Every structure is written in C-alpha cells, then in structure tokens.
Amino acid sequence: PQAKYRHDYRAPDYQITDIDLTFDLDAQKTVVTAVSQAVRHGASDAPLRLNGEDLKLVSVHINDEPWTAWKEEEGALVISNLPERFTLKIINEISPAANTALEGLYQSGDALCTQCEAEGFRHITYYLDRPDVLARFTTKIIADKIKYPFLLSNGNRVAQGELENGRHWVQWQDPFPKPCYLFALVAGDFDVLRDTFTTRSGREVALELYVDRGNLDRAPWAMTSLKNSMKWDEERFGLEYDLDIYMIVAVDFFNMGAMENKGLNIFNSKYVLARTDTATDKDYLDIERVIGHEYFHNWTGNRVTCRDWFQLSLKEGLTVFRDQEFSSDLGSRAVNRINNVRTMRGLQFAEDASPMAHPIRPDMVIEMNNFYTLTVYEKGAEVIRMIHTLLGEENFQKGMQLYFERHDGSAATCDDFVQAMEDASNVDLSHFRRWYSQSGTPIVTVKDDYNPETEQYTLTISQRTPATPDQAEKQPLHIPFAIELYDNEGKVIPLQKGGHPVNSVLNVTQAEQTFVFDNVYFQPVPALLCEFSAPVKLEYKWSDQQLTFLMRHARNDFSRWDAAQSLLATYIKLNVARHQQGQPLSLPVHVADAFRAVLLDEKIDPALAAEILTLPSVNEMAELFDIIDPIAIAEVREALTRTLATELADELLAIYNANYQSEYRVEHEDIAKRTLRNACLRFLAFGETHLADVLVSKQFHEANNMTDALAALSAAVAAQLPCRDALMQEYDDKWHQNGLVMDKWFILQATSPAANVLETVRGLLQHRSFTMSNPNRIRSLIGAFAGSNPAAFHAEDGSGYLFLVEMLTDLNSRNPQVASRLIEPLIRLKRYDAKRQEKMRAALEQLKGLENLSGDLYEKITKALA
C-alpha cells in the first residue's frame, strides 16, 4: 500500500460537471447506472483514470457508443482516446450485504445506507473520487416497496413512480455542485419526526428526522438541537440554510459519529436518540454538539469544500471551532473551554508525540481514514481559535465573509483560509502558517523578574518543539501568549509600557524574547497562557500559594480551574514516584484546604466547582511524565480520591445534599448543580464504606434520570463497593434489549479496577447485547478496555496486548476502520518501560504478519515499529 504526498497535488486531467445515477437496489446485488458529463482540462492524449474498488463492471459507453479503448487496473478504470467533452455511461454491480467495512453502500440492520467520506464513492461506481471534482447530482432509486418504503438522497424530491412487482422509485436532485464524498443514499422503513424552521429572511425549511420504528420518543431533543443550531449559525456567523429540506437519518451501524452529506446527514444513532431515562446530561450535550457540528459543515465543508484530503482540517478544525463556540454560547463557556483543554492536553498531546504524529495539514498519508484525528480536529480548532485570538471577533468575521465570498462553490486550501483572514484583517499571518506544517507540541518556558527600583516586571519566554518521528526540523511558531498580572488584593494590574497600554496577548514569535511591563506597582502573581491561548506545554515554576491565590482571585473561571490543575500536578508526580518505591500518598494539608475552600465558596459557579473536583483523568495525568507507569497512575488517582474523600467528608456530604433537585431538567443551571452533586458522590463513594454503599445504592434506586443512576453505578464499580454486583445485574436485567444504554454498562465493565477485569471482558464477548458486527458495541467493550483501562491493558503479564491482538485479527478482515481505532493504545509503546515495550512490539509484529493486512493497520504498525 502506497503513500500519497501533499506536494504531488495536481489539478485533474478531467472534470465531471453533472452526474445522473440510477440505483436498482437489492441487498445481495445492486445495479448502478452512472451517466456523467465530462470535460477534459489536460493534455489531448491523457486517458481518463477513474477510481473504483470492488465493483463488477458491466458496461462502458461514451456518447452512447460501446467503448473498446479502456482497461482495468488495480483500483481503476483507464479510458483512452476521448473527445474533449462527452457523456460517460457506466453500468456496474455492488453487494451491500457483503460490505462489513461500512464504506460505500452497505446494510445497517434492514436499511441500506451510504458512507462516502473520504473515498467510499469509488466503492459504488467508477468515478473521479476526489474532492476538487464537483458535480451536480441527480439520483434515481428503485426498490421493493415493502422492504424500502422510504428512498432518500441529497436535495429535493423531483419524481416518483410505481412499477410492476411491488417496486417503486423516487428521483432526487441537488442543485449545489458537490464532491462525491457528500453523496448519500438511504433506503428503508423508518418512523419520521417532522418539524420546520423559518430562517431569519423567511425561508421555511422542512426538517425530517428518520429513526428506527419504535424510537420516535427519543427524537425530539435532536430536532430541538437542529433548530438551535440553525438559529445560532444565523446569530453568530450570519449563515442561513440554503435548501427547503433538511433530513437526518439515525442508523445503528456506523463507523464514526455522523456525516454531513448535503441535505441528508446520516448519524450514528448514539448521537441522536435521547430520553431522560436512557441518556445522561453528557449524551444530551454530545447530541447537541454533533448535530451542530454536522449542520455547521453546510458552509464550512459543503458550500466550501477541500481541494484534496491533505486539507481536511480546513473543514474539520473550523467546524470543530464552530461546534465549540455553539456549545459555549448556549451553555457554560468555562466548562466547554476546560473540557476541550482536558482533551487537548490529555489525548491530543500524546498523539503529537506518537509515531502517528502529523501536522494539522498532513504531508503524507497512506490511508486517509487514519487522519480523522484529534490533531486534525482539536488541534485544528485550536489553530482556528489562535487566529480568532490574534484578530478579535470582528476581524475574524470579516475573514469568514471574505473566505466565503472568494471560495463559495469551490474546493479550497488551508492556505486560502489563512489568506482570507490576513486580507480581511491586515494582520500578518505568514509566520503563523507554520502551525499548518509543523507537528508536535511546543514547550514554552517562562522566567520572571520583579524590579522594585523601577516597578518593572520582566518575562523571559522561550519555545522549542522537540523532534517528532515525522519531522527532524522544527522552527519557532507564532504563539499568542495571553497573560494577566494580579496585585496584592487580587485586582488586575493594567499592562503597559513607556506610558502606553499594551495588549495582554503577547506575540511569542522567536526562540527567545523578553517583555517588560512598567508601572507594576506591586509584585504580581501572573496568570500565564490564559484560556489556553496556544496549544503548548507551559514550563513555569509556580509556588502553591501563587496557585491558590489564582484559585481564589483569577477573573476567568478557566484560570482558576487551571491553577488547581497545576497545584495537583506537583503532587501527582510526587506520588507516582512514591508509589513506585512502595510509599503511600503524601499531600500537604494546605492543598486539601484549597479544595475545601472551593466546596464552601458560595459565590463560585457550581459548574466551576464541579470541574475543580473532577480530578485529572489517567490520560491527563500521563501527560505529566516522559515514561508512563499506568498502574502507578491509576493507584495514585484512587489514593488521592480516598485522601480527599476523608479530609473533606463533611463538606462533600453537605454539598451533595444541598444540590439535590427533585425535578430533572436539561438546562444549564440544573446540569451544573447535578454535575457538582455527582462529583461529591464520587469522592463519598471512596470514603467510609458503609455510608458509601448506602448513598450510592440509594441514588441508583431513587434516581429519576439516567445521569443520577449512571453516576451511582459508575461509583459502585470504581470504588468496588458491596452493592456493585447487584446494581450491575439490575441494569443488565432492565436494559439488555437496549444497545445504546448497554454500551454504558460495557464501558463500566471494561474500565473496572477489579483484578479479574480481563476475564470479565472476554466473557462479555458472549453477552446477549454484544456483537462484533456493531462498531458501537465493539468500542464500548474492547475499545474501552484497551483505551480507557490502561492499568489492566498494560498488566505486567502482557495479557492485555494478547487480547487486543486476537480482537484485531478478527477486525482487520471485518472492519479495518474500527480496527485502526482500536490499535491506537499499542502504537504508543515508546512511552512505556522496556519490558512493556518488548511485549507491545511483539504484539505489533504478530499483527504485521496477518494475511490480508489492511492498509489502515499497516500504516500505523509500520510507523510504530520504525
């Protein structure tokens, strides 16, 4: 399998302007007829090279003439001796029932549906399966009436008919030209929720949400979220929807979260279906986010698409930024920012140090589905957010307007986006472009000095990015470095120099520089890299009392939470080294006191308190170390939780009872109170055993909503309470028929700290609610074990790796994309000790040797063993 490189991009020899598709649908054998209008742009003797995979070619015509000048090659149909403009007609067969990869046209339960991003359209017919080729689609679908009463594709329904033998047909037409990755087709039987949204200029859009029969009671929240998305995009970005219909279809068998197909989004039902007894606050907020995200792609992705796949972050970074802004405007900005920072530092940083490291605009790709990454998405969004930070909102919106003005209707580049932002703002971003092309996490080192003679504060800031496996050369970036300076009383010291105000966003552009501030009347406590103003590691030698001061005084909530993270970080490192020598947890009293003060501050937003009382995850903790000891980290996380539970027991219980709510509402204040309450319950579960068992058991049985119930069950599992087995059995008994709900239970099983967790997980491969044919179940049991139980996955005997190898040996043949998700924990071997490294390398060497090794695995395994 061959690498492709960004520097090889060339404009296509041929374009296609219009394509007319006809599907004669059947699960064993679907006949596709594709009639394309084509235009040559290159040399007169260049053949047309069409992409195609696993297609049975039936015929090829050019202007109605059967064509003899062609041949098949590996992955292609090459057609020679063409005129300058012509009609290509291809007829071919495909087999949806055989498609376990879930790429192209496949079967989801009894429905037929498509997934075409990145390069799945080529599994449907021979085409220019590349996103700089944009065409107007017309799609006609013919199918059995009983099995497939609903026949959907992009755009508007323009024709309809009945045929002999219980078949029917519909035709659809989408007026906007599109790359084929945005093609969708859905056939099946559904319940439908219908609603409308009226845009700000008075267009009435019909909204339609298709779900499995019986699930209409779980549809309204998604519908509500869609309307909220449409409204927000209008208020914030000035963007309206551009068609009279918007369809969403929830399918159960899907590789990712969702897909922005124009006018016809297809969603993993996990990000659509919710009811108060089935879904958590977090589900409600995730459904909102993903609905928003796919909607926001309608402009940032569809009306302006990507010239080639190396430009993915042009749509994904910008769209992720848009979903974060949406969630933050509607909810708590502080909680959003915090959690996104947790994700960046805890998960994306690890990727940017891994063998899979790449810039947000990659230079080399073997399997493009491997690059739908935390880097491309979350670091991508951080890069967009840095642009926003440098330009300010008003200039950033001008840049948006200019990007659309220049590029609407076309496929664009990351470089085109940056250029629009520069031209609209007159801010120079030449050096800033280096964030698109350099991989890895910059390390920013800060040293300070207060001069009492001159009332000057001096910051000396340096940066460097370490080499990564993809890139030996690294250079300084344009790092927006936001600061605030606090005086003795907790008030902000105006920033200034030589009698003039200076911007609190510093431009850190060199390996090293110095900034000097005048009229610093008291020795300050700095807040550094405010709001995580650049996606970097901060190295700065804080005192605990500077950090508690920031926890008590900083003006942004984010800085308080972040000061609390810096405070724990010292003690996490300390106690990990202790654990390794057999020594128990040590924690200064004043640290415990700083958390006690948060529990009892009544001014404090309960959402902030809950974040500060949610300890860094094992993945966030692991970012603190070069070599990771996953067993020591897990045990320290537990011991710290036990220690705080004991020191704060009274305050914990009181805040728990105070935040009781009788009514359940999906509303920002209610969520915040409940999140705090359940953060208290978590500690309490790790406290005195009898009271823990009582509290947890009681919350689980009396809960009127899944958030309160799952928090209890989760706490019983995590603290291994006596009530655990009973509670777990009750939830199985009640919920076994419901896969999305069972996923949560599989996650708890997989992530259990119990000594026999691997054995329990193996047995759960036979559980009535598990199947290897469903990506959600797979991720919930197997993925959650490998990726979210690092202590068990990295058991000293290597049983964890061996289990994953067995699973991947199945999944490589069945569903390579899911396989490639699941291999990620093994790809990180170079963060572990020599003994673990040897075993992980041996596991990877077995997988390298599979017959029919997928490209997806190949790419990762090769980079890992280098």
Ligand X SMILES: NCCCC[C@H](N)CC(=O)O
620 among the known binding-site residues?
A: no
Ligand-binding site membership of 623 (annotated):
no
Residue 135 marked in a binding site: no
Query: Of 293, 379, 777, 828, which lies in the binding site for ligand X, with binding defined by CB under 6 A?
Result: 293
Q: Do 187 and 150 touch, CB atoms closer than 8 A?
A: yes
Q: With b meaning 16 or more CB within 10 Å and e meaning fewer, what string describes 80-95?
A: eebeeebebbbbbbbb
- 204-211 and 245-251 strand pairing: parallel
**Of 611 and 856, which CB lies nearer to ligand X in the complex structure?**
856
Distance CA 607, CA 674 (A): 9
Residue 365: count of CB within 10 angstroms of its CB:
20
Q: Could you give the CA distance from residue 563 to residue 548 in angstroms, rounded to a whole number?
A: 7
List the structure tokens of 198: 């009226």
746 binds ligand X (CB under 6 A): no
Which residues, numbered 337-376, are part of the site for ligand X (CB under 6 A)? 369, 372
698-709 burial string, b = 16+ CB within 10 Å, else e? ebbeebebbbbb
Distance CA 802, CA 179 (A): 42
Selection from Zn ion, ligand X, Na ion, none that 111 binds (CB < 5 to 8 A by kind) is none
Q: 575 contacts which partner out of Zn ion, ligand X, Na ion, none, CB within 5 to 8 A by kind? A: none
Establish whether 38 is an annotated binding residue.
no
**Calpha distance 549→551 (Å, rounded):** 5
Catalytic residue, chosen from 294, 351, 378, 859, is: 294
Q: Is 301 in the site for Na ion (CB under 5 A)?
A: yes
**Distance of closest approach, residue 131 Cβ to ligand X, in angstroms:** 11
204 assigned binding-site residue: no
Size of the site for ligand X (CB under 6 A): 12
Q: Report the half-sphere exposure of 396 (CA within 13 A, side-chain side).
A: 16
* Sign of the torsion angle spanned by Cα atoms 396, 397, 398, 403: positive
One symbol per residue from 307 to 326: x for binding ligand X (CB under 6 A), - otherwise; what is it? ---------x----------
Please give the helix or strand (H or E) that residue 717 lies within, else none.
helix 706-718
> Which residue, 527, 470, 465, is CA-closest to 495?
527
Residue whose CB is less far from Zn ion, 297 or 673? 297
Query: Which residue stretch of 10-18, 594-602, 676-684, 801-809 sits at the interface with Na ion (rule: CB under 5 A)?
Result: 10-18
Residue 127 DSSP label: B
65 assigned binding-site residue: no
36 versus 114: smaller Cβ distance to ligand X: 114
CB of 316 to Zn ion, least distance (A): 5
CA angle (382 as vertex; 449, 607 as ends), nearest 5: 80
260 is in an annotated binding site: yes
Closer residue to ligand X (CB): 258 or 563: 258
Q: Which of positions 3-42 make contact with ligand X (CB under 6 A)?
A: none
Question: Is 257 marked within a binding site?
Answer: yes
Least Å from the CB of residue 333 to ligand X: 22
Task: Please state the closest distance from residue 117 (CB atom) to ligand X, in A.
Answer: 4
Binding mask 232-271 for ligand X (x = CB under 6 A): ------------------------xxxxx-----------
Torsion angle defined by CA atoms of residues 169, 175, 178 and 184, in that order, rounded to the nearest 10 degrees: -30
Output the smallest distance, CB 297 to Zn ion, in A. 6
Residues 290-319 that bind Zn ion (CB under 5 A): 316, 319
259 binds, among ligand X, Zn ion, Na ion, none (CB under 5 to 8 A by kind): ligand X
Helix (H, G, I), strand (E, B) or coil at 794: coil
Q: Is 369 annotated as a binding residue?
A: no
CA–CA dist 268, 578 (Å, integer):
44
Closest residue to ligand X: CB criterion: 117
Selected from 116, 134, 193, 804, the binder of Na ion by CB under 5 A is 134
Report in angstroms how near the CB of residue 258 gets to ligand X at its nearest: 5
CA distance 785 to 808: 13
Q: Does the active-site annotation cover 796?
A: no
Q: What mask of x and - would describe binding to ligand X in positions 405 to 444, judged by CB under 6 A?
A: ----------------------------------------
Q: Which two tokens stand for residue 309?
A: 């796949």
Residue number with CB closer to Zn ion (20 or 294):
294
Closest CB to ligand X among 315 and 836? 315
* H or E element at residue 150: strand 150-153
Q: Quick check: 513 and 440 in contact, CB under 8 A?
A: no
Distances (CA, A) of 303 to 138, 197, 242, 410: 18, 20, 9, 7
The residue from 21, 25, 118, 314 that contacts ligand X (CB under 6 A) is: 118
User: Among Zn ion, Na ion, ligand X, none, what does residue 15 contact (CB within 5–8 Å per kind)?
Assistant: Na ion
Integer CA distances (angstroms), 121 to 126, 141, 185, 402, in order: 8, 16, 11, 31
Which of the choices ligand X, Zn ion, Na ion, none does residue 570 contact, using the CB cut-off of 5 to 8 A by kind?
Na ion
Q: Residue 293 Cβ, how far from Zn ion at the closest point, in Å?
A: 6
3-state helix, strand, coil in the chain (%, to 5): 45, 20, 35
Q: Return the H-helix or E-strand segment holding 178.
A: strand 167-178
Q: Which residues are annotated as a binding site for substrate?
A: 117, 257-261
Binding-site positions for Zn(2+) read 293, 297, 316
> Which residues contact Na ion (rule: CB under 5 A)?
15, 17, 134, 297, 301-302, 333, 566, 570
- Contact set with ligand X (CB under 6 A): 117-118, 256-260, 293-294, 316, 369, 372
Q: Which residues form the catalytic set?
A: 294
Annotated binding site: 117, 257-261, 293, 297, 316
- Footprint on this chain of Zn ion (rule: CB under 5 A): 316, 319
